[PDB]
Design an enzyme around this catalytic site. Structure first.
Site, PDB file in Angstrom:
ATOM      1  N   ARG A 179     -11.518 -44.003  -4.707  1.00  0.00           N
ATOM      2  CA  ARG A 179     -10.262 -44.696  -4.688  1.00  0.00           C
ATOM      3  C   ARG A 179     -10.157 -45.102  -3.243  1.00  0.00           C
ATOM      4  NH1 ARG A 179      -6.714 -40.937  -8.733  1.00  0.00           N
ATOM      5  NH2 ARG A 179      -6.756 -43.122  -9.815  1.00  0.00           N
ATOM      6  N   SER A 181      -7.218 -46.353  -1.691  1.00  0.00           N
ATOM      7  CA  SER A 181      -6.234 -45.280  -1.846  1.00  0.00           C
ATOM      8  C   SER A 181      -6.641 -44.452  -0.445  1.00  0.00           C
ATOM      9  CB  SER A 181      -5.177 -45.264  -2.876  1.00  0.00           C
ATOM     10  OG  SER A 181      -5.903 -43.652  -2.790  1.00  0.00           O
ATOM     11  N   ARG A 182      -8.062 -43.742  -0.427  1.00  0.00           N
ATOM     12  CA  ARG A 182      -8.527 -42.759   0.262  1.00  0.00           C
ATOM     13  C   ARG A 182      -8.236 -41.423  -0.532  1.00  0.00           C
ATOM     14  NH1 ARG A 182      -4.882 -46.533   4.415  1.00  0.00           N
ATOM     15  NH2 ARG A 182      -6.032 -47.167   5.321  1.00  0.00           N
ATOM     16  N   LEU A 183      -7.218 -41.926  -1.131  1.00  0.00           N
ATOM     17  CA  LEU A 183      -6.666 -40.385  -1.860  1.00  0.00           C
ATOM     18  C   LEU A 183      -7.928 -39.593  -2.595  1.00  0.00           C
ATOM     19  CD1 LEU A 183      -3.159 -40.984  -1.709  1.00  0.00           C
ATOM     20  CD2 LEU A 183      -4.365 -38.904  -0.175  1.00  0.00           C
TER      21      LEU A 183
END
Ligand SMILES: Cc1cc2nc3c(=O)[nH]c(=O)nc-3n(C[C@H](O)[C@H](O)[C@H](O)COP(=O)(O)O)c2cc1C
Ligand SMILES: Cc1cc2nc3c(=O)[nH]c(=O)nc-3n(C[C@H](O)[C@H](O)[C@H](O)COP(=O)(O)O)c2cc1C
Lengths: 205, 204
Positions: A179, A181-183
């Site tokens: 993602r 979002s890096r998460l």
């Protein structure tokens, strides 16, 4: 393109096929069977890796066909029946990690699929002693030529002993979904033994 | 293609050349992407994952990530050996680096950690890479907590477990594929980091 507990299957193999089929369906992913086959020489602990093509699953694990006799990967495996392969679908932002014990595929099947391969390929198997050191292209062609001539008078070309299939019996399979979002969503199935029920868990990205 | 004539003295030269070409090529959209393979030394179990190559330095190939709590950290910790592959599908090229691992300088580690976006810097703290968690919620709870934890702070500090690691090459292979299946294979090797490099042609 999100991954949640609800989507998880009982048999990780299900989620694999689903994801793989999606990758083949997607025109963005032009070579979804491409994988990185990592191995290591057990005494020394030296790691080697190369790109190969995933062929198919069978009753026990993931199968890949290549030279498993004279090549570097053969020598690692010979000393350490353990391997890992990664499927990485850049555009789909997905990566699958399979880690298990290696096994040599049935000699019948190995031959069966060797037959389907193009003639030029069948011959190339014989002429090229994968990973062996050579002088140059010339040496190589000389061998191709010799073999092309060697098997010239022959309908079906025979399968070399060193060529065939090898399968990875999974002990760990990870489904990673990135993602921006890096998460990223991380899920990994595991069983200490090929006879232990699979166990799913969420890993921190 | 790839022939003896193109080979350089220092494999690192041929690497940069090839890498720059990949960056130059619009077909190759992520040329720094690599597969970092490692293995747990006693057991001999192999693990692998995708990472981004950062850059070379005076001694080898460097990559930045969590080299403390993650699976790869635990493999390296037990066995300072690793391998990485660069695969440029469209350019039909693959480069294989195999060497001993080393932890990059703590300064540099921090230096580059600073350049990373704030959201990133915070993510490093909140996420204990490869650790087991309950769900997204647990994850966000941690993000939020940390985002709030470092809210009153200009520059975010670097975690001890984050930083760079370098691979000092003992084997570098340049593979160039030909639809003919008779790919060009060249591999540089030195038994030791203090042994002159040696080029040789491998059968495909
Ligand atoms: C996309 C791709 C697919 C490949 N598929 C195969 C394959 O099916 N069989 C094989 O023996 N080598 C294959 N190779 C070659 C290996 O990556 C490489 O030549 C390797 O050196 C073979 O074994 P080694 O590492 O033990 O020397 C492929 C390479 C690429 C880039
Ligand atoms: C394209 C791509 C790039 C990645 N880059 C990084 C990176 O720079 N650093 C990192 O720690 N993980 C990165 N990852 C995640 C790792 O591949 C993966 O989550 C791995 O599990 C991390 O360490 P582990 O194997 O020890 O659990 C990336 C994944 C992908 C698909």
């Amino acid at each position: 393109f999100t991954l949640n507990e609800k989507q998880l299957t009982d048999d990780p193999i299900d989620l694999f096929t689903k994801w793989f089929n999606e990758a083949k369906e997607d025109p963005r992913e032009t070579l979804p069977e491409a994988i990185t086959f990592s191995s290591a020489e057990l005494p020394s602990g030296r790691v080697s890796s190369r790109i190969l093509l995933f062929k198919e699953l069978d009753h026990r694990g993931f199968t890949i066909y290549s030279n498993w006799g004279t090549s570097r990967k053969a020598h690692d495996i010979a000393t350490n029946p353990n391997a890992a392969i990664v499927f990485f679908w850049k555009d789909l932002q997905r990566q699958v990690r399979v880690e298990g014990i290696t096994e040599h595929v049935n000699r019948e099947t190995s031959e069966r699929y060797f037959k389907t391969r193009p003639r030029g390929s069948k011959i190339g198997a014989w002429a090229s002693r994968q990973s062996d050191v050579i002088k140059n292209r010339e040496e190589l062609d000389e061998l191709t030529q010799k073999n092309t001539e060697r098997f010239k008078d022959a309908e079906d070309i025979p399968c070399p002993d060193y060529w065939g299939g090898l399968r990875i019996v999974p002990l760990e399979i990870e489904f990673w979904q990135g993602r921006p979002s890096r998460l990223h969503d991380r899920f990994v199935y595991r069983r200490k033994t090929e006879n232990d029920p699979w166990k799913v868990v969420r890993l921190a990205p």
